[PDB]
Amino acid sequence: SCDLNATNYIRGCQSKTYDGKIFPGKGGEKQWICKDTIIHGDTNGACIPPRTQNLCVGELWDKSYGGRSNIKNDTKELLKEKIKNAIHKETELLYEYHDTGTAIISKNDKKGQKGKNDPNGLPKGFCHAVQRSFIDYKNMILGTSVNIYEHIGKLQEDIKKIIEKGTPQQSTENVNAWWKGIEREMWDAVRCAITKINKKNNNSIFNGDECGVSPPTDQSVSWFKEWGEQFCIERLRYEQNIREACTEKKCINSGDKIQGACKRKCEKYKKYISEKKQEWDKQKTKYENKYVGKSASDLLKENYPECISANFDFIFNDNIEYKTYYPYGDYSSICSCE
Numbered sequence: 001s002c003d004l005n006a007t008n009y010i011r012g013c014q015s016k017t018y019d020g021k022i023f024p025g026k027g028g029e030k031q032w033i034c035k036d037t038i039i040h041g042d043t044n045g046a047c048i049p050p051r052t053q054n055l056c057v058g059e060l061w062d063k064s065y066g067g068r069s070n071i072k073n074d075t076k077e078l079l080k081e082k083i084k085n086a087i088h089k090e091t092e093l094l095y096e097y098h099d100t101g102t103a104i105i106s107k108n109d110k111k112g113q114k115g116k117n118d119p120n121g122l123p124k125g126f127c128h129a130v131q132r133s134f135i136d137y138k139n140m141i142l143g144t145s146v147n148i149y150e151h152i153g154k155l156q157e158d159i160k161k162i163i164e165k166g167t168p169q170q171s172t173e174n175v176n177a178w179w180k181g182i183e184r185e186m187w188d189a190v191r192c193a194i195t196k197i198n199k200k201n202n203n204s205i206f207n208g209d210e211c212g213v214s215p216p217t218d219q220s221v222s223w224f225k226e227w228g229e230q231f232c233i234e235r236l237r238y239e240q241n242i243r244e245a246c247t248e249k250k251c252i253n254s255g256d257k258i259q260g261a262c263k264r265k266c267e268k269y270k271k272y273i274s275e276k277k278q279e280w281d282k283q284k285t286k287y288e289n290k291y292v293g294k295s296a297s298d299l300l301k302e303n304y305p306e307c308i309s310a311n312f313d314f315i316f317n318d319n320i321e322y323k324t325y326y327p328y329g330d331y332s333s334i335c336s337c338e
Contacts, residue, residue, distance in 0.1 A: 002195050002208075003192070004192070004198075004199070010058040010089055012056070012058055013056035013058055013086070014093075015096060016103070017029070017054065018054040019050060019103050022100050023102070030053045032047045032227065033048040034048075034282050035048075035148065038147065038148065040145075040146050040219070041218070041219065042290070045282050045285075046220065047227060047282055047283050048146065048148060049132070049227070052223070055137075057086055059082045060086060061151060071159070071162065072158060075162070076162050083137065083186060087134065088193045089193075090133050091133075095123070095194075098126040105125035105128060106124045106126070107124075107233060111237075111240075111241075121203035121210075122203075122206075127212070131215075132222055134186070134215055136219070138179065140155060140159075141159055142176060143175065145219055160175055163178050190215075194211060195207070220290075224283045224296070228303070228307060229300075229304045231280075232300065232306035232307040232310050233306050234272065235269075236306055238269040239334075241265045242262070242265045242269060242328075242331055242335060245262045245264070245265040246262040246334050247334070251338065255337055258335055266335035273316070276316075283296070284296040284312075297313065314326075
C-alpha cells in the first residue's frame with residue numbers, strides 16, 4: 001500500500017552532482033569540507049560529505065529571490081509532509097545517481113565497468129547513501145548537525161519553533177519526541193521510494209526493505225564512515241590503474257627507474273594520498289578521543305570490505321623515513337623496478 005502509481009516531483013531537487021555530473025555531463029563535483037572553528041555535536045572540527053552538501057530539502061526551502069525558509073508558517077502536519085516528500089525525492093535521486101554508476105561508491109575497481117549490485121539487486125552503494133541521507137535529515141530535524149549553512153541552521157531553528165507551538169508544553173526535548181513519533185513514517189517514505197523501483201528495474205522484485213526494515217542504525221561517525229568507504233574504493237581504483245600501467249616489467253635505465261604511464265598513475269595516487277591526509281588526521285583525531293580506546297582504522301575496516309587491505313597508519317604515516325623509502329606509499333613496490 002503506497003502511492004506507487006502517483007507521480008510527484010518537487011522543485012529545488014535536481015539530479016545529484018556531488019561526485020560529478022551524470023554522463024554526458026562532466027565536472028561539478030563537490031569536495032569534503034573540513035572546518036576548524038566549528039563544533040559537531042560536542043567536539044571540535046568536522047568534515048562535511050559531498051552528498052550532505054547536495055541534500056534535497058525540497059519544499060522546506062524557497063531558493064527564489066535570494067532564498068528563504070518555506071516553513072515559517074507551517075503546521076507540524078505540513079512540515080511532516082514536506083520532510084517526507086524531500087526524503088522520498090532524495091531516495092529517488094540517489095537511486096539514479098548510483099544506478100548510473102556516477103556516485104564514487106557505486107563504482108567498480110575497473111573503469112567503465114559497473115559495480116556489482118548488492119545482494120538484493122540494488123545498485124552498489126545506494127542503500128549506504130540513502131541511510132546516510134536519512135541520518136542527515138534526522139540531525140537537521142533534531143538541530144544536532146552542523147551550523148555550516150546559515151539557511152539550514154535556520155531550518156533547524158524554524159522546525160524547533162513549529163514543534164514548540166504545535167505540541168503540549170512540558171523544548172528541544174519535545175523536538176526529540178516529535179522526531180521519534182514520526183521516524184517510522186519518514187523511513188516508510190524511503191521504503192515507498194524503493195518499492196517504486198519495480199517500475200524501473202528487472203534485477204529482482206523490490207519489497208522496500210532492501211535498505212533495512214528500520215531506519216539506521218552519531219552523525220560525525222556516519223560522516224567519517226562515508227569518508228572511509230569513498231577513500232577505500234578510490235584507493236583500489238588507483239591500485240587497478242597502477243597495476244594496469246606498471247604490469248609489463250618495462251623499467252627504463254638510469255638500478256632502473258619507473259617511466260611513462262606507470263610513473264604517471266603512481267604520481268596520481270601519491271597526490272591523492274597527500275590531499276586526503278589532512279581529512280584523515282582531522283576525522284581520526286575527533287573520533288579517537290571522543291571514543292576512547294576505539295580505533296579509526298577499526299571503524300572503517302569492520303564496515304567496508306574495500307578497506308581491509310588499507311593499512312591506514314602506513315598510508316598516512318608522517319614519519320621521516322617513509323617519505324624517502326616509500327615514494328608512492330603502500331603502492332611503492334608496484335611503483336618500482338625489478
